[PDB]
DNA sequence: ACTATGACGC
DNA sequence: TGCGTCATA
């Protein structure tokens, strides 16, 4: 129950199974339990991919590639793709799906919201009280109809494994230490059987859930058993989870810094960083990164789950690639003006709802030829929640950056931010 | 030339 | 602070 052993807290990730898929076939029934998938808002090569149905998914459809190329292995393939607006992508109908799910959850506990389909959650509390309340009661295999216990058993078939693991699980459960890490987990699991249980309840969406002892853990979990189950990961089920798992794939180091891991200290595989000492650690990744990496390879992490589900920003962006780089002052003039539109809009529904007002707008743009996602960033005072006024107002911060009579090099890139709400 | 939000260091 | 860079859905 230590800290020393990073035991001390229950932590769920909750995540939506391919999301965006879920939210169209709730509107169109006839899309439901049939492989399809959901493309961006341009059609080329039938539209990029973003949300596969799992149905689909078994055709080796992936997102991230084409359509048509998508199409081939999975001809029965069905598409929806993203309504249109100001000549961008609209995705008030997700974004309106999240708040369902997102205000459930929160009727079980605080969350914090780490995306438009997931957010953690802090059981710790929660827990305790379950574990008042319960009063010495066994917990049945029968609370847990969706759980999957990382690392056993030891020793449609599918889920034979499941309850046989299940089992084991609970037969060796503490019964009268009622700050058992491994029971507190459990209880963990129950509460999010009931949370998960709700939101379907609810809104039809089904989804999958990590329980553990810190986020980094949960989130791993989260992706062990999809879709629609959880899996619950003990401290003493990672050594042997960690033993083969890819280090990119831990919270944090799927980019540079893990990359950087991997290459420096000649290893592939988190478990494998148990054999530095932390003063190894600190020398090559430094004091912070080199303490982090020390205790997380051991299962251990302390950042804290942090009520968040207001928006820290609101902004939108377009790119324009190749022969369509913006070039005039006409066409930059234009765009930023559509993207103040839509800031407009979400701004005035934010202020409505919420009743804060963002102060800054942070204006954002990439020019031809960098390889970088944005080539700089400017920002001033956002005193009118005006369209016509914000789009002036960028241009000019715009402008300021640079052949002072076009754009040369060309932008392939704009972007505008509201924030620094008050 | 295949499309958002959040955090950190200084 | 404001900004470049990094992380990730
Ligand atoms: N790089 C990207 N660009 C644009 N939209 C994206 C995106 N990545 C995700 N989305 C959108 C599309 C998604 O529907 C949604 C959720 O992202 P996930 O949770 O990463 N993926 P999903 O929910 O689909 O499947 P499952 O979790 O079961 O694996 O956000
Ligand atoms: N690579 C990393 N990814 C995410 N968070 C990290 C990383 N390195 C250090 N930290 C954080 C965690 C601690 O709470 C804190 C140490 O005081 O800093
Ligand atoms: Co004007
Ligand atoms: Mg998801
Ligand atoms: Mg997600």
Redesign the pocket.
Known sequence: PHMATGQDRVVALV?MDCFFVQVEQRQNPHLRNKPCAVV?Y?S?KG??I?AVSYEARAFGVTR???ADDAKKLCPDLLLAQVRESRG??N?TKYREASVEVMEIMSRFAVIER?????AYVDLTSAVQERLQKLQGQPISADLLPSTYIEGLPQGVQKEGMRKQGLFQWLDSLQIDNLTSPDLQLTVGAVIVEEMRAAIERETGFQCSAGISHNKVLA?LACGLNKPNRQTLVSHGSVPQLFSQMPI?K?????????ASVIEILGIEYMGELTQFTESQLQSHFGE?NGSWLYAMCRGIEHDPV?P?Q??????????F????ALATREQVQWWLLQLAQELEE?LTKDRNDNDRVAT?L?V?IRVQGD????S????CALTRYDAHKMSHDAFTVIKNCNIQTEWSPPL?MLFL?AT?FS
């Open positions: 995540d961006q341009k080329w539209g990029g973003i991230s590639m084409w961008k992508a995705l780490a995306s438009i389909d997931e989130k990119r831990i919270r944090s180091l799927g980019g540079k810094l893990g912070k942090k968040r207001l928006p820290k920003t609101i902004g939108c962006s377009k790119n690639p190749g022969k369509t979400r800054q942070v954002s390889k970088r996602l944005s700089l960033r400017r920002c392939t931010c620094k």
